A paper describes a structure:
Using genome-wide transcriptional and functional analyses combined with structural and population genetics studies, we conclusively demonstrated that a single amino acid change in the binding pocket of the glutathione-s-transferase epsilon 2 (GSTe2) gene, coupled with increased transcription, confers a high level of DDT resistance and also cross-resistance to pyrethroids in the major African malaria vector An. funestus. The topology of GSTe2 indicates that the 221 amino acids of the An. funestus GSTe2 (afGSTe2) are divided into two distinct domains similar to that of An. gambiae (92% similarity between the two species, with a difference of 20 amino acids). The active site is located in a deep cleft formed at the interface of the two domains, specifically by the interaction of H1 and H3 from the N-terminal domain and H4, H6 and H8 from the C-terminal domain.
To identify the structural changes responsible for the higher activity in the resistant GSTe2 Benin allele (119 F), its X-ray three-dimensional structure was determined and analyzed in comparison with that of a L119-GSTe2 susceptible allele cloned from Uganda (UG-GSTe2). Overall, the structure of BN-GSTe2 and UG-GSTe2 are very similar. However, significant local differences can be observed between the alleles at the C-terminal ends of H4 (containing the L119F mutation; residues from 113 to 128) and H8 (residues from 213 to 220). These differences can be described as a concerted movement of the BN-GSTe2 H4 and H8 helices with respect to those of UG-GSTe2, which opens the active site cleft. However, to accommodate the bulkier Phe119 side chain in the Benin-GSTe2 structure, the N-terminal end of H4 has a dramatic bend, which increases the size of the H-site in comparison to the UG allele, where the cavity is tighter. The H-site surface representation of both proteins with a bound GSH confirms that the resistant BN allele has a larger putative DDT cavity than the susceptible UG allele. An assessment of the DDT dehydrochlorinase activity of the recombinant 119 F resistant enzyme (Benin) and that of susceptible L119 revealed that the 119 F allele is 3.4 times more efficient at metabolizing DDT (82.9% DDT depletion after 1 hr reaction in the presence of the cofactor glutathione (GSH); P < 0.001) than the L119 allele (24.4% depletion).
Residue numbers in the entry:
A (entry chain A): 4 to 221
B (entry chain B): 3 to 221
Amino acid sequence: LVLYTLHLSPPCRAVELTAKALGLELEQKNINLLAGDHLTPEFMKLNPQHTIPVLDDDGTIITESHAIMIYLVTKYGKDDTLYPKDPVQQARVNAALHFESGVLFARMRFIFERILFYGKSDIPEDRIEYVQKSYRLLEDTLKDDFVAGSKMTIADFSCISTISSIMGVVPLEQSEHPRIYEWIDRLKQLPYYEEANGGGGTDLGKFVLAKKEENAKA
Amino acid sequence: KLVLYTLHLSPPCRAVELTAKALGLELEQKNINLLAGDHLTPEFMKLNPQHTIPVLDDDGTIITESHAIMIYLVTKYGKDDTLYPKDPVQQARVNAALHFESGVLFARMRFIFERILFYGKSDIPEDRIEYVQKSYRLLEDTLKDDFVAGSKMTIADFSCISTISSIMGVVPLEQSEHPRIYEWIDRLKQLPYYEEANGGGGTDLGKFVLAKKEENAKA
Ligand SMILES: N[C@@H](CCC(=O)N[C@@H](CS)C(=O)NCC(=O)O)C(=O)O
Ligand SMILES: N[C@@H](CCC(=O)N[C@@H](CS)C(=O)NCC(=O)O)C(=O)O
């Protein structure tokens, strides 16, 4: 299994968490977004949307982190605990997956991408507010121990990959979000959490802040 | 007995309406007027703590979120899997397109529309327009086949067209640069239920956002 990837990228780290949970080894091929590696004609052939992650499973090309996670659990999970087959339980996981793509990740990207790639040095107040609203939505979703119920699923891997990044840029206040902090501690009990995700999320937040300051020059 | 907490102006609600028509299902609609804050009540919060529509009530079981609802309906009621394949590779292509709709097409539409509809804004910033125009290109390049996830129509087409048919009325979609998107829109327009389930509401939402933008300027 080959992952076209960059550790700073949240949906990349979502798939790394999944592969660790599944006991799969991934061969990582680095796509340096900061050098434009994803903008080549060769990469475009892999993904016409020119985004990472992309999985190569023995020549079969699977794009998009959520799709990749679902595919890996379906094909290689010894059971379905990370992505239930039961239709109602599965719908709850799917709903949380799309909440991650549509709300958590999208709002993070609306602050990050312009800093990382287009030379911006500001974070508009409305976009901070949009992120804080996404934190409230998440806190209210965490009625159980994990985002899509009492068992940990790929939806948690998706959500934490983003949360562990954006909170270093838009602070996530513990007194106001106790459930999110208890849930982060559950994920930090995983032996592979820091290698698969924690380090990379912390590093992305710091990088965004460092880039914002550097870009302020000239 | 399928009940949908819904508003016909809402894209993800029309994606589910298109899915129910394709499956031959009847939905009882319970109208949720977002402008009146019907989704922000304590009773609605119990249906969905994210307070979004659509929400499905299937004989007492609550299922949130349009893409989840579509997969659920095809899974449970499809006479075969053509709208959401069981094959893991073809399914992955559909899932990738569905998350493209939520993460890219819908998100960028909402980043223009929400502030006008609900928070009184009267402008559309140029950087937001570009974000949407970039999304059109991403979609155009995705459409190498007749439908967004291959040569067969799936729930990913319903999701994508419910947003595209809305945002094109506000951020114009230039035809000369996007022939594949126009050809695809015409394939969906051949469905006998397309206008009723989706078309009219997409057109109405676009005109409604432009009207409300004007209203907000005038106080
Ligand atoms: N829905 C996608 C989002 C992928 C995504 O946006 N990745 C970013 C990096 S975090 C990217 O590749 N950006 C480069 C580009 O959009 O051109 C997923 O979860 O795989
Ligand atoms: N990923 C969700 C998105 C739902 C969504 O944002 N719906 C809007 C109407 S188009 C809504 O209910 N907005 C009210 C709010 O967020 O408070 C889906 O596809 O169901």
